Amino acid sequence: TCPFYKKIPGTGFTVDAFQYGVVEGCTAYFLTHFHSDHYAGLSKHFTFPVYCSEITGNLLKNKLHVQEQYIHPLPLDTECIVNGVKVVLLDANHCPGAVMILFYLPNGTVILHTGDFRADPSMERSLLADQKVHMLYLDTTYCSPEYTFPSQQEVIRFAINTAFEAVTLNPHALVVCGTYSIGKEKVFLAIADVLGSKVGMSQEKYKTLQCLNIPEINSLITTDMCSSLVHLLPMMQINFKGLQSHLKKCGGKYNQILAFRPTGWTHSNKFTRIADVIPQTKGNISIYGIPYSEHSSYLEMKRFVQWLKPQKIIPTVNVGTWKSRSTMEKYFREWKLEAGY
């Protein structure tokens, strides 16, 4: 049974609600992005209309085999009528194809559903500038002041400078980057660009990347592992055992691995600056955990919400415990008292 925070009142619409069977009264199922917790339940046997971005619809057709007749891609930043209701899709600054959804209800209420997002001041000059929002369905993943991390640009500068120094010292070093979903592609693309290499990967991951409308992608990635000195592997394999085993497979081309695990936040964020980050090392293998987030920090979230001034907030993450729900409600009231709405 579908929870209340996935239903849009006064419509036949749901958001990210594919794992509940046939939802009573639902005429259109929206999908914000192609991450497994959000598409859980979709498959080639799905027979109701799915609304989404073009990139999400490429992934639904090629990776999950959803039939074409049920995929309804919408352009971004463009007013569209769906089943009698005006909607707009906005870039969520999350993974490729991820959107926020503005719903203009027939009674005059305006609802923003952020999906998953990383708030940015550039959103203050989108189509959100133009009118008031009554209800905000908010990605609260990091809604507590302990959740701090650097800008994505600082993180990428650290990664590129670390990889370029290692491989210039030792031209026989291999760079490996962990992945387990779409998102965070800038990590491995920026490192391969400074090294003058294509990125090598499995046929399954190549297929996924070919769905993402990245400019000049054919110049950047390959399935020919032997030709490349930046490899992608499953995130589960980014450990000393898994990396040893991969180095065996490269036919004595390499004698060192430098590996990256883009995580979200970890408690090593509470003490260490990005500049001061060091790897875990065993023999000729070194592993860096780098804090590349595709969700809002606490401060980015608070800025967005204090600018938007919604009348009501509905969290969509961390909703399963009374302690989490009470913590989030306290911060919402602080923000509102401080800003005066």
In this complex, which beta carbon is closest to Ni ion, that of residue 116 or of residue 185? Answer: 116
User: Per-residue x/- marks for Ni ion, 104-123, CB under 5 A?
Assistant: ------------x-------
Question: Could you say whether residue 198 binds Ni ion (CB under 5 A)?
Answer: no
* Gap between the Cα atoms of 94 and 230, Å rounded: 24
Contact 122, 310 (CB under 8 A): no
User: What Rg, from alpha-carbon coordinates, does the chain have?
Assistant: 22
The interface with Ni ion within residues 52-81 (CB under 5 A) comprises: none
Beta bridge partners of 258: 175, 286
**Which one-letter amino acid corresponds to residue 329?**
E
- Which 8-state DSSP code applies to residue 236? G
Closest contact distance (angstroms) between CB of 33 and Ni ion is 6
Question: Could you say whether residue 35 binds Ni ion (CB under 5 A)?
Answer: yes
Closest contact distance (angstroms) between CB of 301 and Ni ion is 15
In this complex, which beta carbon is closest to Ni ion, that of residue 184 or of residue 246? Answer: 184
Task: Give me the helices (H) in the chain, please.
Answer: 36-39, 54-62, 152-169, 185-195, 203-210, 240-249, 298-308, 322-339
* Gap between the Cα atoms of 183 and 174, Å rounded: 22
* Gap between the Cα atoms of 303 and 269, Å rounded: 21
| Segment lying near Ni ion (by CB under 5 A), choices 33-41, 50-58, 85-93, 163-171 | 33-41
* Gap between the Cα atoms of 248 and 21, Å rounded: 46
Query: In b/e form, how buried is each residue of 157-193, taking b as 16+ CB within 10 angstroms?
Result: ebbbebbeebbeeeeebbbbbbbeebbbbbbbbbbbe
* Gap between the Cα atoms of 2 and 304, Å rounded: 28
Closest contact distance (angstroms) between CB of 94 and Ni ion is 6
In this complex, which beta carbon is closest to Ni ion, that of residue 116 or of residue 231? Answer: 116
Closest contact distance (angstroms) between CB of 115 and Ni ion is 7
The interface with Ni ion within residues 268-287 (CB under 5 A) comprises: none
| CA-wise closest residue to 29 among 77, 82, 79, 95 | 82
Closest contact distance (angstroms) between CB of 214 and Ni ion is 18
Closest contact distance (angstroms) between CB of 250 and Ni ion is 33
Question: Could you say whether residue 139 binds Ni ion (CB under 5 A)?
Answer: no
The interface with Ni ion within residues 251-270 (CB under 5 A) comprises: none
Closest contact distance (angstroms) between CB of 201 and Ni ion is 21
Closest contact distance (angstroms) between CB of 35 and Ni ion is 4
Binding-residue total with Ni ion (CB under 5 A): 2
* Gap between the Cα atoms of 187 and 232, Å rounded: 11
Helices (runs of H) and strands (runs of E) counted in the chain:
8, 18
In this complex, which beta carbon is closest to Ni ion, that of residue 56 or of residue 228? Answer: 56
| Segment lying near Ni ion (by CB under 5 A), choices 27-35, 49-57, 264-272, 302-310 | 27-35
In this complex, which beta carbon is closest to Ni ion, that of residue 73 or of residue 264? Answer: 264
In this complex, which beta carbon is closest to Ni ion, that of residue 257 or of residue 294? Answer: 294
Enter the tokens of residue 322: 């009374």
In this complex, which beta carbon is closest to Ni ion, that of residue 187 or of residue 287? Answer: 187
Binding site for Ni ion (CB under 5 A): 35, 116
